[PDB]
Design a protein around this ligand. Structure first.
Ligand code: HEC
Ligand code: NA
Ligand code: NA
Length: 75
């Protein structure tokens, strides 16, 4: 789940959000430890937040990515 979750985060939330030290640029909240807020903010297949629609697989993969990476290329 971790790699497709990165694609979800990268293309769909990073433009605004931050995530630990992996992504420290953006004005919206840092999504570190936001799994429960993500699942409350999004319903699988229902268009919502910022025009985004997420599949069930998207939501699971993204949370696995947030848990595993939420960081420096040399660490
Ligand atoms: C800019 C167009 C954004 C995009 C792209 C994403 N998010 Fe967002 N998010 C944005 C703002 C300005 C805010 C604060 C106002 C609000 O609507 O809450 C948020 C907030 C969240 C939250 C809740 C934050 C908290 O309670 O601390 C969550 C859980 C969240 N956003 C999730 C989220 C996800 C999973 C995204 C990728 C699919 C995503 N956002 C994109 C702005 C923007
Ligand atoms: Na960002
Ligand atoms: Na949900």
């Amino acid at each position: 789940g971790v790699d497709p979750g990165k694609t979800v985060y990268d293309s769909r939330c990073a433009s605004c959000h931050r995530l630990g030290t992996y992504d420290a640029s953006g004005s919206a909240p840092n999504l570190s430890r936001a799994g429960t807020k993500i699942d409350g903010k999004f319903t699988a297949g229902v268009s919502g937040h910022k025009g985004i629609t997420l599949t069930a697989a998207d939501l699971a993969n993204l949370k696995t990515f947030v848990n595993a990476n939420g960081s420096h290329p040399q660490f």
